[PDB]
Design a protein around this ligand. Sequence first.
Ligand code: LP5
Ligand code: LP5
Ligand SMILES: *[C@@H]1O[C@H](CO)[C@@H](O[C@@H]2O[C@H](CO)[C@@H](O)[C@H](O)[C@H]2NC(C)=O)[C@H](O)[C@H]1NC(C)=O
Ligand SMILES: *[C@@H]1O[C@H](CO)[C@@H](O[C@@H]2O[C@H](CO)[C@@H](O)[C@H](O)[C@H]2NC(C)=O)[C@H](O)[C@H]1NC(C)=O
Ligand SMILES: *[C@@H]1O[C@H](CO)[C@@H](O[C@H]2O[C@H](CO)[C@@H](O)[C@H](O)[C@H]2NC(C)=O)[C@H](O)[C@H]1NC(C)=O
Ligand SMILES: *[C@@H]1O[C@H](CO)[C@@H](O[C@H]2O[C@H](CO)[C@@H](O)[C@H](O)[C@H]2NC(C)=O)[C@H](O)[C@H]1NC(C)=O
Ligand SMILES: *[C@@H]1O[C@H](CO)[C@@H](O[C@H]2O[C@H](CO)[C@@H](O)[C@H](O)[C@H]2NC(C)=O)[C@H](O)[C@H]1NC(C)=O
Ligand SMILES: *[C@H]1O[C@H](CO)[C@@H](O[C@@H]2O[C@H](CO)[C@@H](O)[C@H](O)[C@H]2NC(C)=O)[C@H](O)[C@H]1NC(C)=O
Ligand SMILES: *[C@H]1O[C@H](CO)[C@@H](O[C@H]2O[C@H](CO)[C@@H](O)[C@H](O)[C@H]2NC(C)=O)[C@H](O)[C@H]1NC(C)=O
Ligand code: NAG
Ligand code: NAG
Ligand code: NAG
Ligand code: NAG
Ligand code: NAG
Lengths: 137, 137, 592, 590
Amino acid sequence: KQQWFCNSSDAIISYSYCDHLKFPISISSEPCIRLRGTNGFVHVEFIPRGNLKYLYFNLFISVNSIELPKRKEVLCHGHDDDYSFCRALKGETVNTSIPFSFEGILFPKGHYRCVAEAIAGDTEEKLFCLNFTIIHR
Amino acid sequence: KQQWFCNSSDAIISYSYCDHLKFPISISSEPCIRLRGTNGFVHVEFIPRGNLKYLYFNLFISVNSIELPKRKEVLCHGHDDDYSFCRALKGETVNTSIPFSFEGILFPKGHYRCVAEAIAGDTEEKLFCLNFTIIHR
Amino acid sequence: PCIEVVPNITYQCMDQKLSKVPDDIPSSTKNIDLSFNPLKILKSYSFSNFSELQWLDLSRCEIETIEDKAWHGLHHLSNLILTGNPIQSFSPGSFSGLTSLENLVAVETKLASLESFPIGQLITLKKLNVAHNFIHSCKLPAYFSNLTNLVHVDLSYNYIQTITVNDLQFLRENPQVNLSLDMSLNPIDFIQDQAFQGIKLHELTLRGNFNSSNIMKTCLQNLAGLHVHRLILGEFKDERNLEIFEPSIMEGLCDVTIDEFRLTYTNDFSDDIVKFHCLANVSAMSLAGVSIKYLEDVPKHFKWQSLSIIRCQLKQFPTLDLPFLKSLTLTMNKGSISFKKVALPSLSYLDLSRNALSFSGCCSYSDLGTNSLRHLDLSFNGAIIMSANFMGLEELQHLDFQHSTLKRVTEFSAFLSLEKLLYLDISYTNTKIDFDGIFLGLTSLNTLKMAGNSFKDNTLSNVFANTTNLTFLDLSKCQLEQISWGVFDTLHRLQLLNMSHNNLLFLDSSHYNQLYSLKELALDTNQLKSVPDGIFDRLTSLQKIWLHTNPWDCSCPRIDYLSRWLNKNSQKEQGSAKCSGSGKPVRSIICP
Amino acid sequence: IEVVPNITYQCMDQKLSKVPDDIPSSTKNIDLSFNPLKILKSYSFSNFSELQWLDLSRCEIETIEDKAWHGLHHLSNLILTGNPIQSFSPGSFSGLTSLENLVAVETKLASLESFPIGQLITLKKLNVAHNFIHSCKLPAYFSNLTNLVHVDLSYNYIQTITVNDLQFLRENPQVNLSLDMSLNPIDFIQDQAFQGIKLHELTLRGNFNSSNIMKTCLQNLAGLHVHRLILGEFKDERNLEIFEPSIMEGLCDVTIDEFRLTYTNDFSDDIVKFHCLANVSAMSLAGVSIKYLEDVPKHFKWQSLSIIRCQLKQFPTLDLPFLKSLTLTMNKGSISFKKVALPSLSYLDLSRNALSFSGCCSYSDLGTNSLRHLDLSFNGAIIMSANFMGLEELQHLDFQHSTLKRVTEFSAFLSLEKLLYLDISYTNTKIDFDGIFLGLTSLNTLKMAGNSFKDNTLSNVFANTTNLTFLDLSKCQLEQISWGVFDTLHRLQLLNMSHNNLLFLDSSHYNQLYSLKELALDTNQLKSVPDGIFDRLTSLQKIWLHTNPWDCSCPRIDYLSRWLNKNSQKEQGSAKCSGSGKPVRSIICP
Ligand SMILES: CCCCCCCCCCC[C@@H](O)CC(=O)N[C@H]1[C@@H](OP(=O)(O)O)O[C@H](CO)[C@@H](O)[C@@H]1OC(=O)C[C@H](O)CCCCCCCCCCC
Ligand SMILES: CCCCCCCCCCC[C@@H](O)CC(=O)N[C@H]1[C@@H](OP(=O)(O)O)O[C@H](CO)[C@@H](O)[C@@H]1OC(=O)C[C@H](O)CCCCCCCCCCC
Ligand SMILES: *[C@@H]1O[C@H](CO)[C@@H](O[C@@H]2O[C@H](CO)[C@@H](O)[C@H](O)[C@H]2NC(C)=O)[C@H](O)[C@H]1NC(C)=O
Ligand SMILES: *[C@@H]1O[C@H](CO)[C@@H](O[C@@H]2O[C@H](CO)[C@@H](O)[C@H](O)[C@H]2NC(C)=O)[C@H](O)[C@H]1NC(C)=O
Ligand SMILES: *[C@@H]1O[C@H](CO)[C@@H](O[C@H]2O[C@H](CO)[C@@H](O)[C@H](O)[C@H]2NC(C)=O)[C@H](O)[C@H]1NC(C)=O
Ligand SMILES: *[C@@H]1O[C@H](CO)[C@@H](O[C@H]2O[C@H](CO)[C@@H](O)[C@H](O)[C@H]2NC(C)=O)[C@H](O)[C@H]1NC(C)=O
Ligand SMILES: *[C@@H]1O[C@H](CO)[C@@H](O[C@H]2O[C@H](CO)[C@@H](O)[C@H](O)[C@H]2NC(C)=O)[C@H](O)[C@H]1NC(C)=O
Ligand SMILES: *[C@H]1O[C@H](CO)[C@@H](O[C@@H]2O[C@H](CO)[C@@H](O)[C@H](O)[C@H]2NC(C)=O)[C@H](O)[C@H]1NC(C)=O
Ligand SMILES: *[C@H]1O[C@H](CO)[C@@H](O[C@H]2O[C@H](CO)[C@@H](O)[C@H](O)[C@H]2NC(C)=O)[C@H](O)[C@H]1NC(C)=O
Ligand SMILES: *[C@@H]1O[C@H](CO)[C@@H](O)[C@H](O)[C@H]1NC(C)=O
Ligand SMILES: *[C@@H]1O[C@H](CO)[C@@H](O)[C@H](O)[C@H]1NC(C)=O
Ligand SMILES: *[C@@H]1O[C@H](CO)[C@@H](O)[C@H](O)[C@H]1NC(C)=O
Ligand SMILES: *[C@@H]1O[C@H](CO)[C@@H](O)[C@H](O)[C@H]1NC(C)=O
Ligand SMILES: *[C@H]1O[C@H](CO)[C@@H](O)[C@H](O)[C@H]1NC(C)=O
């Protein structure tokens, strides 16, 4: 059940919700991601099921079935953080859009998965879980 | 046994030949080593039983009966070496005073042993082997 | 309905598609979470027979009306969370009976102001959160005279554009009132002259307020007068950042009186800002998320007593001669910088963790310039080369190296002069203990953590011979295959020994005869098929023991001592020891 | 003492009266050193004719009497050092039909003029160091010895070099010769003395007491053409107090392909930026207290730069656009890598510096596309963050003993499709991710000893690493191996899995290894082997199974004891039975 997609010079990104955590959120890039390199924005719209003071992610990436080991990525360290949304409390409105910028590594070609569990550090309660699908050329 | 000795403001050094290697050398320091810190010269006169092009040492140190792992100290790498004598050949007379300098780290007190095999990394044979005894206070 | 969390005590009705409050709940409940239920309205005496609730959470409950009288049976309720509720009318005393309330959270409760806010009875209050609302007044109603215990207030993300001498008119009346204010994310353009004259603020947070330099510059000049403890200042990666940012913008901070300054992320940054002249008399300078790249030439007169750099971008390690500095903290640096000598004779606390820092010739007086350092955290870094055993640093109680790559530590007694050391962590340092004098000198040591390392011939040698007052010892994940004789004969004050996650093949009763004060012993997940008889019998202070994930051989008469022993002691065993093949527990087995 | 059976014997320090009759007539090397001899007798060894190498060092000898060297019609190396055989009368060098190398160090000799080595046309190397020679003068008999290419004149009494001394070389610009002048107190070199002379290499180490004297002496090398010049001093000798770069001017009157500095008591970073070095093709420091090396002028024509056992405080900045080769090795410091721009760069060696290196590796690090060899061994933390975009011409990568970070977090060698050789041994890498070696499809040689795998299971990482001829998985704490693991490696000739903790082998790995020559499995924990396991190991030349606790029960040990007995010539070391000690070769099941 896609909730989004986008095409680009190399990537065809797309995501559905996770079979086990459907809590709602809506999210988008701008531009669509080029894996070769990219500056843009991540538009995020949703209302969290827990405080984002200690927001972080768990990424379960995999290329052509080859699991990469669990990758972790912190967004809100819970002190003088760089994002507005870090102050969001449980069940508050969140609209922001986050700038990002990166120059690419040479990624192997083919079919990537990535589940991104968002998580509230204060409670380890899962806030949400997307399930991306990237195809690269 | 005692081939030489000297005592300083915190140490008392002395050597003999090694039980099973007697090939001769007469070495000494001026001043006598203070483990806390010392600038001086190591005077060395002897006849190499081998080329010195790759002279190195194996130090088997031991503090109050606790053996440290074998320690290795190259003197001649056989290439643009810092000392006259790396050029010396088996048989050639060798006489020199080698400058040295250090600042003391803290040494535990008591009975050290250091046997120093000298080795000719060309043939890998033994040139000579002193058995020192430092007594620190 | 509802979940089962700590029964009759904490429950979770979150997102239970609930019409309204269910009575099918133990009256003794002290924690409810109803958030995410279409309650729509708070029919009064709702929370009547939930008489000892502490923590009420009604976030995103779609509630429009608090039919007052709703909070009646709740003498002792402290936390009340009403976030994301469309409450327009807070009809007076709506907060009725909440006599013990300390913390009130009414974020995104569609609130126009504090004037219209019926909270003047709740003396018990300390924290008040009205972020994300429709407020425009910085001003604090006169009923705060009544709220003695209110100490913090959060107005961030409202519409306050202006701060007058009246908005603050109240703090002047009581300059023996400790209050802290957060006004981050409020599009502020005007503070008038003398607005902040003779004001007593603890924490003032001004983040992401200003749309450009001149507004800030000027708004800032007009804080003049204020005595503040902690001023937090900066913007946010996800909001409008001042295109330009020059130190001049904090002219007049020199009229504002600060003991702790705290700078955060900022689109444009200037290395000259922390040298900037108006910060000289802070006692706690501090940076976070800031793209500062060098930090040299900080003027020597400055009276910073703690400095702290966190998630910044230093390209090279600070040059600092600050003589009044008691605590330095540089951490989570972008770089991979390399340590350089300093001279901070007042220094007592150095946390250089998480920088991929590299440190050559550690550690002695020469490196730091204090003789009063007590805490050195060099954890989560790169190559630390030990060419010096802490001569000069003998005042130290906490050395952490964990997860850094220590080198040469086994080539001399590298901790010899650390006779006062209480805690050592070298866990995960890729160290292979080749030398039995590794720990000489460490006679006071209590905690020793040295997991994830390894031993010559995989043998636990006699390295503890005079680390006598050791009370915690972790040798987990050290690839041990066996244990030399005598090793533990002296650790009489040892309480926790972890030797789990190793490859031990047997144990030897010659180790446990004298661990008189030992309460905890992990030996799980090794490869023991068996244990000598009577091995645990002299462990007189023992409480917990782990023995699982070993292939225990349960053939009788072999397995008798242990089965018996664990059965008698089942209480102490943690996890569950099991038999090879059958898979059955060990305490289960009964020999003839 | 014979070391080689009937072909070399060592008689050193044997209080030997004189040569033994005893010893065989075939012996090819012989060493009588540290023996009292005093006279090399006449015909002293006519019988030892099949002889290549003779050494008589410190034999206390005072007289070479006549025709001692017969027959000696094939002797190449002769070593008389440390014998007081002062006077060599035209009757000592008899019949060395084939002498390449003569060593008369410390033989009291006082001049070459009268030194009797006239018709030894074969000679390649003369060494006369540590003697009493007072004259640089190169004899005319040198015309007869067109083989000679190297003379050692070291540790003698030479103070002067004079135009007639080097006349011989003026009248022989076809002769290729090399001189080692080191440790002579040379105070004067006459003007024009090095006009029209060519040396291959000249070594002037430890000659000068005084700054000025060096300056003037160096002056009068003017006109010299020399392939490799070697300058500096030693630490156990009287050095120069001051060494100002200007002391080098007038090297710009001499012509040098390869310059080489060594230890210099006093040294100035700007000495290596001297203008008179700009046209040297190979610059090289060694033992020097250089601390910075930054603003080197772009006109410099250096094609290779070697910094060794120096003291750099900071990684050099360099834009030398014809530098083809950079070796920075054994640095005193720990230093950390900084970007450079070396577009001619093809061979970088940065080993053994305790070097740290954030964001390894890609084009922007170096500024070349022609890098064929990168060696970052024996260093600190190397943080893998790019995967070699731009560096795809790499054939040899070495990481040994450095601490490699993040290498398991992506396919970090992805772009190295041309890579032949990879060493990641002792990098303490814990392999988590089966795609770690993606990209390495040209790869022959993979060394990854002393690491480890998740769950101590050798997993499927060689799926696409298909031209592997040599794989070393020794010391990786292995307990078992995933299933298809080796099925791709059709070209594999060597597999090391020794020093691991395997308890069982599975036969599916080792069938199909038809190309395999060497297989090491010693020093695991094996007790047994699937019947059949080694049958299709057709190319097999060597197998190691020793240091395993083999169970020699019958009928269990049947296949193997048989097999190993039949293949006894291939087994390296010996597989012994647990308990007894008996070779598994020798068990016979009934
Ligand atoms: C085979 C499996 C691959 C899995 C990919 C994920 C893991 C990749 C880890 C490698 C990158 C990381 O270790 C280093 C990194 O982050 N580099 C950024 C950094 O570069 P430096 O050169 O070190 O300054 O800072 C630079 C300046 O900011 C910046 O240029 C560099 O950025 C990168 O190289 C990051 C990579 O290019 C990754 C790009 C992420 C792609 C986003 C996909 C989103 C899909 C939707 C899922 C939510
Ligand atoms: C339980 C102890 C037994 C083991 C003792 C032996 C091993 C000691 C090794 C520790 C020191 C070594 O790792 C680093 C070193 O080399 N330091 C020298 C170096 O100092 P920096 O740290 O680089 O400034 O460079 C400086 C500048 O030159 C120099 O001053 C420093 O000097 C030292 O640290 C050397 C130590 O003080 C060791 C002294 C050796 C004493 C000689 C004994 C004499 C008898 C010899 C018998 C064979
Ligand atoms: C003023 O208010 C604060 C908050 O109640 C007091 O408490 C200190 O500061 C923080 C708030 O940021 C508290 O959480 C800490 O617990 C307190 N400090 C420490 C070290 O724990 C502060 O003390 C008050 N000031 C005065 C003078 O009473
Ligand atoms: C297989 O691996 C081992 C271990 O790495 C090799 O090295 C042997 O063991 C030690 C440790 O490296 C060395 O010092 C020895 O020199 C090696 N053994 C012998 C008998 O010399 C071993 O050489 C490797 N064998 C092959 C064929 O590659
Ligand atoms: C994430 O999405 C994938 C794609 O739908 C889910 O896996 C499914 O797709 C597989 C191939 O991609 C199918 O072959 C599988 O049948 C199917 N998965 C299962 C378990 O049947 C994946 O499960 C999704 N995310 C999760 C579980 O978090
Ligand atoms: C003894 O050591 C082990 C291993 O370090 C400890 O287990 C912890 O670390 C594990 C690493 O494998 C992690 O799985 C866990 O975070 C943690 N164990 C559990 C059950 O959470 C264990 O804590 C130590 N035992 C003690 C202190 O008794
Ligand atoms: C001159 O003779 C020398 C000595 O034999 C030759 O040998 C040198 O140069 C070779 C390559 O050019 C090397 O392979 C030799 O090992 C090297 N020997 C020494 C001591 O440097 C040299 O080739 C001849 N000259 C030229 C210009 O080729
Ligand atoms: C160097 O001398 C020491 C004694 O000064 C030797 O130590 C002796 O070791 C042998 C072991 O065979 C014993 O005979 C003695 O009991 C030891 N004496 C003491 C005081 O310990 C040492 O063996 C010598 N060096 C060697 C063997 O290389
Ligand atoms: C820092 O605040 C102090 C707090 O009193 C101010 O005064 C000090 O610094 C002055 C700068 O020269 C000195 O003249 C005084 O000795 C000292 N005075 C007091 C009362 O402490 C000062 O205004 C502030 N400094 C700056 C540079 O803004
Ligand atoms: C979030 O921001 C964008 C900017 O235009 C807007 O389109 C979106 O609808 C915003 N907010 C809401 C509440 O939808
Ligand atoms: C070796 O050198 C010293 C240094 O002066 C000298 O006294 C000694 O006699 C020399 N020995 C010989 C044989 O020259
Ligand atoms: C370097 O080469 C150029 C061009 O041949 C020339 O102008 C200059 O004289 C040379 N300098 C030397 C050899 O010192
Ligand atoms: C290696 O080969 C397999 C099977 O053909 C392929 O799926 C895999 O992705 C290849 N390696 C890459 C793309 O790096
Ligand atoms: C530990 O060693 C110390 C110092 O080397 C020594 O005094 C003692 O013999 C040991 N400790 C005890 C309690 O004996």
